[PDB]
Amino acid sequence: KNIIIGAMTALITPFKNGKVDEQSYARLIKRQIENGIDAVVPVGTTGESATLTNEEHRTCIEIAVETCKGTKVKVLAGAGSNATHEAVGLAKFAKEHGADGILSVAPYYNKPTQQGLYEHYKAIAQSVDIPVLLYNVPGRTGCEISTDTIIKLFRDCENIYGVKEASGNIDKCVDLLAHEPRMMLISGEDAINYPILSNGGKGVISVTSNLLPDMISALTHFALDENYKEAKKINDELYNINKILFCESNPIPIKTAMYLAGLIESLEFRLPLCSPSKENFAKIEEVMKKYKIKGF
Amino acid sequence: KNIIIGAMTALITPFKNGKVDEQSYARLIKRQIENGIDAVVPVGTTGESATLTNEEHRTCIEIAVETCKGTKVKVLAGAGSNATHEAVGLAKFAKEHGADGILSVAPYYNKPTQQGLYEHYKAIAQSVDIPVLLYNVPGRTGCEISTDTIIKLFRDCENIYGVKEASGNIDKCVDLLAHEPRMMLISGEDAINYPILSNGGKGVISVTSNLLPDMISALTHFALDENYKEAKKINDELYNINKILFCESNPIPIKTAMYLAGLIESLEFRLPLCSPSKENFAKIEEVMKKYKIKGF
Amino acid sequence: KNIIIGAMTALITPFKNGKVDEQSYARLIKRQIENGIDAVVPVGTTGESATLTNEEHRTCIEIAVETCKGTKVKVLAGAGSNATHEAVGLAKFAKEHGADGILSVAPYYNKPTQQGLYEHYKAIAQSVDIPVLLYNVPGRTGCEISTDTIIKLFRDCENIYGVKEASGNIDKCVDLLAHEPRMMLISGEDAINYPILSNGGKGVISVTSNLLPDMISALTHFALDENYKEAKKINDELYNINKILFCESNPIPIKTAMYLAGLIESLEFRLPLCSPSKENFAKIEEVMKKYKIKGF
């Protein structure tokens, strides 16, 4: 199977006067490339996929593909939906814009059955010929892609090559790689990046890497090269920022950090997302002061 | 305040050859009207809002508005979204096409803060001049509208008149009606319809009423007239069907039941929703046999 | 079946210089009797069952039996354990000292199966000839007595006449009384006393009644005679004190309230229970000011 692994970044989508800041988006993606990042995830959950239009979805996938062109950096485009017909459309569309693969979240809100999840993802995989990475985040979706459903999908469809897990369940991460050791388990939970990698995980799709791309990539590459003592050291010193970046729902804290670090120009969200509490604003700024934040 | 209360039905949306069966949809809505139902809810979660197009969304709202014309039955249209801009658009659209009010579910998947939930619903409320009923279902949305947020919204925007609760939290319903007894608490959980009504709840938005509208109608009005013994007897008698109508994700069991009762011609869902088990199919069929299901 | 229903109080156990204040204990039970309480629960969870010795267990049961001598107030003695052979000893023993019935908590910590729970309670019921009330509170024990396990015990064992539910699950309270309407459902959660009573519950085992015994008894008997509007009015007015009495683990808040009201002489617990935070201390003093606390 063709795969997309390593240190990956769920990119924020900077706004300026209600529109996508196409200059900051490109500037931010070349900052990721210059710090050892292996792939970028445009218009994911961290990029406020829910409040973006279809034309903004296309623009940012295109900017990612073009900014990475020539580099070894891959583009793993966010293309998911709780409607199967729409998920297939978004997958085909992503391929037409030059993405190397798609990240497809489990259908949210409507809670499909395990059988339905299989048929949902099977249709998506047969629409395109590019890698498909599943995204399991039950706290947000209200549903769980079971270990047997993930493995069945991995074995039955070529392009499904693994799953990005955000479930805080290291038991499940042992379960997966013990019954199907060939899949690519990707951490979608920054705080436990090292434990997932040390059990055979082959990458992360990180939120913290928006602010500290150099540290997240070093952590990932240390682990893949089996230097677990140096990988754990970075994971240990990243814990404080890893937790405070979720003091409120992602991506509210990370955009606050990016704005405070001067990497984005305005602290703008699209409703129902908004600026954080005054207390958490100070707590994010305080925790930031103990990390050296790479510039442009 | 303008209100929409009483016995209400979250309508299923029947499909035939992948398209909305517009003639059964109208026939089903007139079956609700003829059995004492006070309002119907088109294109809600039970109506598979997620897999419907904008043009079908409008079609089923129009069919609902058109068939309740001349009757006393109100149309509480489903118009919610995890994007405020679309939720405002969907709300304005419902009013322009004759809906009497909107049911607006809490933003799903994206997890807005309580502050963000306030600004989200405030934008929807200021967009229209028809009643707006909040919908809290944390198991599906991943977020919870706190009691203080609901009460703040009820007091700050007048078209917001209450909340539909599917939370399995009778403590919260005591909390709500003890600190703000003027709001309209609506039961969104058929099994606990009576406890919610007996604490001051003023209506239900039911799933069971799709199959047994006469029984749910009697329950609601018995309770509203404070005949609790006669209301509770129906609630106790409906418990068995109330539970198994959720043996799989709603609306998988109720559509199965409607098909088994012969009220729709095809047992079709749109992926990622699917037909249930062969075993869940048989236990839905068994429990149905202990109830009298009115025909057309 | 012999039953013990109505308004009941989970008695606190006042300490003085590390010993049980035996005269205050009697005085406190006499304040309950004079304010319409129907039964008292010595050596329960609210009475710090865990940190009392067997001889203090006996002393407090005997003081309760002696103080209710001549009155119509029943003694529902706490006699539970997660070791069956000891739970049987405590049940036999409670009867030998004049208790009218026993409240038996579900085995904690060791998490028995439903089969194990069945055999546990069957042994206790066959050990004595006084009414046995099961006590289900999964948040404290780590296990749940299922609806079918409760009903099987009610039908198979003569002495078992109901359950005291502290599970925040009004669905389960519909489940119980719809499939077995002859059992005595007792509310073990003060905030939802009225909803449980309005569904057929026949009494409460209260914590707040330690502070406001007259108000809890008025609520109970209003509800039992069916004046539900009068019962709900008291339950709505009691919500604030009912919640703030659990800002920390029971009985830490209630003992603080009893001390502030001057009903007990010293704010003593046995470790690992301790005095509350400074902030929670102030919050209890706030809420008490909105209620009339009957003296001696």
Place this chain on the structure above:
Amino acid sequence: KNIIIGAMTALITPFKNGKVDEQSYARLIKRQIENGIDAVVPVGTTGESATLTNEEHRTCIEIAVETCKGTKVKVLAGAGSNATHEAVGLAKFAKEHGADGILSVAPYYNKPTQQGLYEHYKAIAQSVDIPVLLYNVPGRTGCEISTDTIIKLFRDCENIYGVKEASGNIDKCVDLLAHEPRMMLISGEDAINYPILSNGGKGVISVTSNLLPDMISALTHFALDENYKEAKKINDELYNINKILFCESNPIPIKTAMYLAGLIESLEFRLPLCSPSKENFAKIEEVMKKYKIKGF
């Protein structure tokens, strides 16, 4: 600090005709010693701590002390309670009988506050001069020892040297060892033994080692020797048996496994524990079939 780390076994307690099979106990403890175990834990939760008497508590600790005479294998005796005065007593007695250290479970059922938990363990630590290991298992106790409480106890009392964690929370184990890298984190969840060890944990207190002591010992020592390829290899192969050993409450599956393997002589529990369902009984024997169970 003096510590007790490495591969450890939470010993089952075999019964024969309602009595502790003392002879069989010693034979099983010497089977653990002969297979690389570094310490054994008598009368813990796996040993049915709740249903043993105080003198049976003494009997099983003493046999352990006597059977480890002459070996390097330590005795980490279970001596815990939800009553602090009893927890101090059980610790003193455990030391007076020759134990090398204490395992002290968090107070169950009575849910002490974080402040109360600190004073609880401080009393136990100041009671004895042998190592004290904290035990956090919130699913059974109903309480959680916060990370800050664990760290405060580690720094404030000499003999408190770490915590055993059974919380299914790999985030918390990063939290602990990143803010206090000097403590001894011990895994109390067999399925995630390696991830906890791979993050700096220095031992396990196992259930599986009752059945497969050589495999659990090899896993730990490989991990302690930083041979992470071989530690994960064993952990991946043990996942199936590790999970099926909790299809019912521990120690119901492990005692069933020991009986099926012929390592214990009768399948007896003390109520409320009992033999498993036939269905789960068959599932345990099946999963056992892919492992080599060392004899005596």
